[PDB]
Design a protein that fits this description.
Blueprint: E1 5-11, E2 32-40, E3 46-48, H1 51-56, H2 73-84, E4 89-95, H3 104-107, H4 110-127, E5 131-135, H5 142-166, E6 173-179, H6 182-185, H7 190-194, E7 199-203, H8 235-244, E8 252-257, E9 259-263, E10 285-287, E11 297-301, E12 306-311, E13 316-319, H9 323-336, E14 340-344, H10 356-363, H11 385-389
Length: 391
């Protein structure tokens, strides 16, 4: 029994335009939820970025008192989900590509790192999280790379102390979202960081996009040696780099996109393009559940683990993963002995048989092939009465 992890991001702004609530999270196919994002002040304080979504919004069934003794919002809903599904772990993701977090300043001093670690663990202790997920994008030089190691070490120490004194000896989790681009991961001190991390979520997507001159595949497993300009990056090169630096394969989680990246005015992969067109929530990016577009043909490149839609009349290509590609990446996960799968983000997936999450879980071996470690339910230090009592 292999015990692969099935990890997905739930973004706290999904409750608005995306109309995607924690009750819609496919928890029957997931082992970990990454709740995104908390923000980081320059003094190191980690704090909730959206008090309404996070703790204040009243879902159906919630009380409407406001004496401030209890938590609501998505946090309460996630705690309810942890009660129903005892192998569902919920981590607080800190940072992200939000322009709302300063990692460089706090991580560079001992005081900043202790303020980060203590405020994040207090959030975990108050809100009922199973761990923390650090999303610093990205350490840009050697000084920041060492500061990343020292920050992870400080967080690990404070999580361990919290677990000893208030977690009945529970090992709370510490993970990271990490880059697949060589210029970025070669800057990291990978083996040093690995001492303090439970797993690495490899952001194996966004390989191609609006910043390019030629259209390309955004999440391919392997380089296209027949035409390398169409594959500016490839996952296998990154996996080998982390493996070589000393990360065990089972600690590498393969991130996968629940969205497509579009290129307009193009003949196809490796050809010039002009613009990215429209999108679901930003130009040039389409939810997977909005794909493929009507009238476009889908091409499957089994050689490199990639697929794309192409409308010849509109000269539009969209790089996204079909179920066939998801199965290839699931085969890649098992063949390489990787730790499992990660997705960004839950609101983009299809429902039913075309769900990429369900497709990957099937190819991994089904429910029996998933991690069965139990989550943590007791949070006796929480300021919130319903968290302390357990809902």
């Amino acid at each position: 029994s292999a015990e692969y992890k099935s990890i997905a991001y739930f973004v706290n702004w999904a409750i608005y335009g995306r109309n995607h609530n924690p009750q819609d999270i496919p928890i029957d196919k997931l082992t970990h939820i990454l709740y995104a994002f908390a923000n980081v002040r320059a003094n190191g304080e980690v704090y909730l970025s959206d008090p309404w979504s996070d703790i204040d919004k009243r879902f159906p069934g919630d009380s409407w008192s406001d004496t401030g003794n209890n938590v609501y919002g998505c946090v309460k809903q996630l705690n309810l989900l942890k009660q129903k599904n005892r192998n569902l772990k919920v981590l607080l993701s800190i940072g992200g590509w939000t322009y709302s977090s300063n990692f460089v300043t706090p991580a560079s001093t001992d005081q900043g790192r202790k303020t980060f670690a203590s405020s994040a663990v207090k959030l975990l202790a108050d809100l009922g999280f199973d761990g923390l997920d650090i999303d610093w994008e990205y350490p840009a030089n050697e000084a920041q790379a060492t500061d990343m190691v020292l920050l992870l070490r400080e967080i690990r120490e404070e999580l361990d102390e919290y677990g000893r004194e208030h977690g009945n000896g529970t090992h709370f989790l510490l993970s990271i979202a990490t880059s697949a681009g060589p210029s970025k991961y070669n800057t990291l001190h990978i083996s040093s960081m690995n001492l303090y991390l439970d797993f690495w979520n490899l952001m194996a997507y966004d390989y191609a996009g609006s910043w390019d001159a030629t259209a390309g595949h955004q999440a391919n497993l392997y380089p296209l040696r027949d035409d390398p300009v169409s594959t500016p990056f490839n996952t296998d090169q990154a996996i080998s780099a982390y493996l070589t630096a000393g990360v065990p394969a089972h600690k590498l989680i393969l991130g996968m996109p629940l969205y497509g990246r579009a290129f307009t005015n193009t003949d196809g992969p490796g050809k010039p393009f002009n613009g990215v067109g429209q999108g679901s929530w930003e130009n040039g990016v389409w939810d997977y559940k909005a794909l493929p577009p009507a009238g476009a043909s889908v091409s499957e490149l089994r050689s490199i683990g990639a697929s794309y839609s192409y409308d010849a009349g509109k000269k539009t290509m969209i790089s996204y993963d079909t179920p066939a590609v998801a199965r290839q990446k699931a085969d890649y996960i098992r063949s390489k002995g990787l730790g499992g799968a990660m997705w960004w983000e839950t609101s983009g997936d299809k429902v039913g048989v075309e769900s990429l999450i369900s497709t990957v879980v099937d190819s991994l071996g089904g429910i029996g092939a998933l991690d069965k470690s139990v989550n943590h339910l007791e949070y006796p230090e929480s300021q919130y009465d319903n968290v302390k009592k357990g809902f």
